[PDB]
Amino acid sequence: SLPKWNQPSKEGKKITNLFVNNSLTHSKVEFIPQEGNKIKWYACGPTVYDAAHLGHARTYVSFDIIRRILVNYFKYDVFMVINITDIDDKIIKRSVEEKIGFTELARKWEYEFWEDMKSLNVLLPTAITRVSEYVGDIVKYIEKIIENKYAYVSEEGSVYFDIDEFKKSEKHFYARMEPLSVKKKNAYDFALWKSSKPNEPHWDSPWGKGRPGWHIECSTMASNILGDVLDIHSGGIDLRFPHHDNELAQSEAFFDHSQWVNYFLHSGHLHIEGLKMSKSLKNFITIKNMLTKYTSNQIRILFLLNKWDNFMNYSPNGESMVQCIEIDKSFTNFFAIILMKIKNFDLNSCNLYWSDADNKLNLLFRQTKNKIHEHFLDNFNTPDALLAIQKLITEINIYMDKEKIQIGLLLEIKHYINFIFDTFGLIY
Amino acid sequence: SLPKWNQPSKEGKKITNLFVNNSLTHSKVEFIPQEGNKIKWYACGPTVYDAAHLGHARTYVSFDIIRRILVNYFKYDVFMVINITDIDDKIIKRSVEEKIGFTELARKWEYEFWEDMKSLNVLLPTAITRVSEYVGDIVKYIEKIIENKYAYVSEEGSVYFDIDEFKKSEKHFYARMEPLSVKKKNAYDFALWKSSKPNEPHWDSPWGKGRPGWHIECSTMASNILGDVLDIHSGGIDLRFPHHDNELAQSEAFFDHSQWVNYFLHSGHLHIEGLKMSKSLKNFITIKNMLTKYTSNQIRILFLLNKWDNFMNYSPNGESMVQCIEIDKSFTNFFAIILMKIKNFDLNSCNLYWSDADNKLNLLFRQTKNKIHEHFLDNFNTPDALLAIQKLITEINIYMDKEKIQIGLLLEIKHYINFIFDTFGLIY
Ligand SMILES: [Cl-]
Ligand SMILES: [Cl-]
Ligand SMILES: [Cl-]
Ligand SMILES: [Cl-]
Ligand code: NA
Ligand code: NA
Ligand SMILES: [Zn+2]
Ligand SMILES: [Zn+2]
């Protein structure tokens, strides 16, 4: 009555001693690639029917940071895929009210979403998959689930996942990450294919005209590009159930195996004034509106200060952003001085003896490098790594103001801090 | 009758399976840091009495590349020290002819040396040590060697290393890297301290006015800053004997231990028309003169194409540089084309299905990442790594011209190539 997780074998794999909070094990576990240093990563993407707000930014910026740590810092080989849900009930409903076509609405808000991501310096994934371009692939995916006896077709033409048949199999467990949250055979069964009314958009299928169900999209596209095993699957914690648990059931049924994803990472909720940021609650702040008050670096520092997997509470009116603006100011001033000193330094006039002051700054510099390395291994502890950089910057500023300058030491410190800020997504 | 080498223990150390041609073992061996991921590195530096030429550039650029591989690629923690020999017989002889003063002449050519390095994009070391700033430390260093009975004082006031006493100790072996290359007690004894001739600059010492000997400065400066064990010691192959072997004898005598350096890397010499480039042969090409004919990238491509520890022959009149100019042209065009395609790419108009064409380029992209990784582990095989990038760019160019473009895939490929070019010191 308990789900089981199998860790990848270490032989032949890049091992960093990295530990990540995995929602499958509900614990921190060592991260081991399925193959060598490669990481196959699928991330759930936006439903392009409206603007993105700060909550969305929290997920996409937080996992953008984690990706930068994995690639830039640990030198993993990351293959990332994000879907665009351009077919949806919300897209259909908004398109009729606006009296614009479904595809025209979806492409407009898809465009604004990628513009907003670029404004926050979120790297684009390796592959972008639209649901509208994979409808035929979704049908074939559903056909195989039916062939495996894990799906049934209703009279109206819909197709439903058969949870009961899925559970009976010993190899398969349903609702791994949220076990307690759990005309059809069973109420808890969900639709792989929805029979479309004549007034709704539809696609031809063996079972009749219809639309893809909520969850089938991600399982189809991720399996086609990445295959039977995914190293990482990311998303917001809200998507954990029923969305992601249903992705696992669909892909396990399709491949008839036990583990579709080795590591499931979930970003914490963003609450504004104690309630989750939601369009329905009307407490949302769009990414564009946030950018008219704050810079991209400041917004990224906000998410660096709140651990990616933890709960976060945003205080509006700039209460939470006050610290972010102070840190951004400290980084900006530090880079100004160190860059000017490196540029203007004159070797002939200076004395290049290696003094105790030089040795002390050098020892703290190597010490800070190790502190940050432990923090990144500690489930991407960016808040403490950011504090480590600040402590180092305080001592470098003292050294630049008073001590005689070892130009090479400062140049090497600048290269490191630039390397860490590229890992954070900061641009100075 | 043969020297012995002790490999560092792997427990607690960063292991990359990197293999480097070590002149102590005379073979390729796995590189293991003495402590953690740290690398203490000392590289012998210029004698600042004249302009630098292409032969000098080959050594400093080659080890600039290796340093970039160690730090930027493998993320080792490198602490590098370079000396400036601003006291020398050649400097003294030229200073009387120029009548501009000893220190002013030495400071002039030091300035031009650093300007030439900056022109080639050679990063400055962590610490720069001038011999003139360490004469007092050199005296104390010689005093400790005499206290260990490994040096004796002549009547004139010079101090000489006693090789015979050094060899007798079982822990000490003389001429480890070139065993066959081997008044005073013995001809093979070398001078740690030289009694100063009239009209020459001199420094006070217990044994009388004098100048430091040829080799003592490197052992002293490296020992004060880096300590009793050096992970890496670099230089031109000519310096292997007698300079570097005498550095080992001096430092082993000072600390009375067995191994001052774990790894000794020697860059091959650059021959022009079959003879080594030398000022005495009058076949030299200055870095300044070379830079009026070729760009920094082209000069770095020349050294990338010739493996660092192997011999290379430069053909004048641009014969060897013709290939370099072609490669620099292709890299510039690639960055122009890929940036233009990225800029003009429109997300709405394109189709983002992941096609077979995209999958093949992605599979080639990840394969090239592993090819380059093996080359860097293969004793910094930059010639084969550069070929890997060229082949990848040719396939990207074909993909960009005809196939449909996955914007995310191209951006990720461009970032990797920028990451490799930053390791090479190329700037586009
Ligand atoms: Cl959205
Ligand atoms: Cl999400
Ligand atoms: Cl020189
Ligand atoms: Cl040299
Ligand atoms: Na939920
Ligand atoms: Na020699
Ligand atoms: Zn999804
Ligand atoms: Zn030296």
PDB file of N, CA, C and O in Angstrom, chain B residues 184-205:
ATOM      1  N   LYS B 184      85.103  25.685  -7.005  1.00  0.00           N
ATOM      2  CA  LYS B 184      83.963  24.905  -6.546  1.00  0.00           C
ATOM      3  C   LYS B 184      84.373  23.484  -6.163  1.00  0.00           C
ATOM      4  O   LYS B 184      85.387  22.951  -6.626  1.00  0.00           O
ATOM      5  N   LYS B 185      83.561  22.871  -5.296  1.00  0.00           N
ATOM      6  CA  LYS B 185      83.742  21.455  -4.994  1.00  0.00           C
ATOM      7  C   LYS B 185      83.561  20.611  -6.246  1.00  0.00           C
ATOM      8  O   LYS B 185      84.361  19.713  -6.533  1.00  0.00           O
ATOM      9  N   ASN B 186      82.494  20.879  -6.991  1.00  0.00           N
ATOM     10  CA  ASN B 186      82.143  20.107  -8.169  1.00  0.00           C
ATOM     11  C   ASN B 186      81.682  21.055  -9.261  1.00  0.00           C
ATOM     12  O   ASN B 186      81.111  22.115  -8.987  1.00  0.00           O
ATOM     13  N   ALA B 187      81.929  20.660 -10.507  1.00  0.00           N
ATOM     14  CA  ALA B 187      81.490  21.480 -11.627  1.00  0.00           C
ATOM     15  C   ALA B 187      79.975  21.609 -11.635  1.00  0.00           C
ATOM     16  O   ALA B 187      79.433  22.680 -11.936  1.00  0.00           O
ATOM     17  N   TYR B 188      79.273  20.524 -11.303  1.00  0.00           N
ATOM     18  CA  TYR B 188      77.817  20.503 -11.374  1.00  0.00           C
ATOM     19  C   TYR B 188      77.140  21.327 -10.281  1.00  0.00           C
ATOM     20  O   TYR B 188      75.916  21.493 -10.336  1.00  0.00           O
ATOM     21  N   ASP B 189      77.880  21.834  -9.296  1.00  0.00           N
ATOM     22  CA  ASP B 189      77.293  22.750  -8.323  1.00  0.00           C
ATOM     23  C   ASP B 189      76.922  24.074  -8.987  1.00  0.00           C
ATOM     24  O   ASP B 189      77.645  24.572  -9.854  1.00  0.00           O
ATOM     25  N   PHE B 190      75.791  24.644  -8.577  1.00  0.00           N
ATOM     26  CA  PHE B 190      75.309  25.907  -9.119  1.00  0.00           C
ATOM     27  C   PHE B 190      75.194  26.948  -8.011  1.00  0.00           C
ATOM     28  O   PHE B 190      75.121  26.618  -6.827  1.00  0.00           O
ATOM     29  N   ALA B 191      75.175  28.219  -8.412  1.00  0.00           N
ATOM     30  CA  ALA B 191      75.272  29.330  -7.472  1.00  0.00           C
ATOM     31  C   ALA B 191      73.885  29.784  -7.028  1.00  0.00           C
ATOM     32  O   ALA B 191      73.053  30.160  -7.860  1.00  0.00           O
ATOM     33  N   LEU B 192      73.640  29.737  -5.715  1.00  0.00           N
ATOM     34  CA  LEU B 192      72.452  30.359  -5.140  1.00  0.00           C
ATOM     35  C   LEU B 192      72.638  31.862  -4.959  1.00  0.00           C
ATOM     36  O   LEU B 192      71.689  32.633  -5.132  1.00  0.00           O
ATOM     37  N   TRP B 193      73.845  32.291  -4.597  1.00  0.00           N
ATOM     38  CA  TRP B 193      74.160  33.696  -4.384  1.00  0.00           C
ATOM     39  C   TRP B 193      75.464  34.022  -5.094  1.00  0.00           C
ATOM     40  O   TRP B 193      76.424  33.253  -5.030  1.00  0.00           O
ATOM     41  N   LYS B 194      75.488  35.158  -5.781  1.00  0.00           N
ATOM     42  CA  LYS B 194      76.648  35.595  -6.545  1.00  0.00           C
ATOM     43  C   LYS B 194      77.237  36.839  -5.901  1.00  0.00           C
ATOM     44  O   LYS B 194      76.524  37.825  -5.693  1.00  0.00           O
ATOM     45  N   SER B 195      78.527  36.790  -5.578  1.00  0.00           N
ATOM     46  CA  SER B 195      79.221  37.989  -5.122  1.00  0.00           C
ATOM     47  C   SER B 195      79.213  39.008  -6.255  1.00  0.00           C
ATOM     48  O   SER B 195      79.481  38.664  -7.410  1.00  0.00           O
ATOM     49  N   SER B 196      78.897  40.260  -5.933  1.00  0.00           N
ATOM     50  CA  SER B 196      78.621  41.245  -6.970  1.00  0.00           C
ATOM     51  C   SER B 196      79.911  41.826  -7.532  1.00  0.00           C
ATOM     52  O   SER B 196      80.800  42.238  -6.782  1.00  0.00           O
ATOM     53  N   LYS B 197      80.003  41.845  -8.861  1.00  0.00           N
ATOM     54  CA  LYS B 197      81.097  42.509  -9.543  1.00  0.00           C
ATOM     55  C   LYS B 197      80.935  44.024  -9.459  1.00  0.00           C
ATOM     56  O   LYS B 197      79.827  44.530  -9.271  1.00  0.00           O
ATOM     57  N   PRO B 198      82.031  44.770  -9.595  1.00  0.00           N
ATOM     58  CA  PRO B 198      81.926  46.233  -9.558  1.00  0.00           C
ATOM     59  C   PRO B 198      81.080  46.749 -10.713  1.00  0.00           C
ATOM     60  O   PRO B 198      81.032  46.154 -11.791  1.00  0.00           O
ATOM     61  N   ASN B 199      80.400  47.868 -10.471  1.00  0.00           N
ATOM     62  CA  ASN B 199      79.520  48.548 -11.416  1.00  0.00           C
ATOM     63  C   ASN B 199      78.179  47.831 -11.563  1.00  0.00           C
ATOM     64  O   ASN B 199      77.316  48.326 -12.297  1.00  0.00           O
ATOM     65  N   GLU B 200      77.968  46.647 -10.890  1.00  0.00           N
ATOM     66  CA  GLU B 200      76.681  45.974 -10.951  1.00  0.00           C
ATOM     67  C   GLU B 200      75.827  46.337  -9.738  1.00  0.00           C
ATOM     68  O   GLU B 200      76.360  46.682  -8.678  1.00  0.00           O
ATOM     69  N   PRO B 201      74.500  46.274  -9.857  1.00  0.00           N
ATOM     70  CA  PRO B 201      73.651  46.397  -8.666  1.00  0.00           C
ATOM     71  C   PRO B 201      73.881  45.237  -7.708  1.00  0.00           C
ATOM     72  O   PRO B 201      74.230  44.126  -8.116  1.00  0.00           O
ATOM     73  N   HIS B 202      73.698  45.506  -6.418  1.00  0.00           N
ATOM     74  CA  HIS B 202      73.981  44.508  -5.398  1.00  0.00           C
ATOM     75  C   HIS B 202      73.028  44.693  -4.227  1.00  0.00           C
ATOM     76  O   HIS B 202      72.381  45.733  -4.080  1.00  0.00           O
ATOM     77  N   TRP B 203      72.942  43.650  -3.404  1.00  0.00           N
ATOM     78  CA  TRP B 203      72.101  43.624  -2.216  1.00  0.00           C
ATOM     79  C   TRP B 203      72.910  43.079  -1.051  1.00  0.00           C
ATOM     80  O   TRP B 203      73.760  42.206  -1.227  1.00  0.00           O
ATOM     81  N   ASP B 204      72.642  43.600   0.141  1.00  0.00           N
ATOM     82  CA  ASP B 204      73.360  43.145   1.325  1.00  0.00           C
ATOM     83  C   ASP B 204      72.947  41.727   1.699  1.00  0.00           C
ATOM     84  O   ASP B 204      71.771  41.359   1.623  1.00  0.00           O
ATOM     85  N   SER B 205      73.929  40.925   2.093  1.00  0.00           N
ATOM     86  CA  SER B 205      73.697  39.565   2.554  1.00  0.00           C
ATOM     87  C   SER B 205      74.737  39.234   3.611  1.00  0.00           C
ATOM     88  O   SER B 205      75.781  39.891   3.689  1.00  0.00           O
TER      89      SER B 205
END
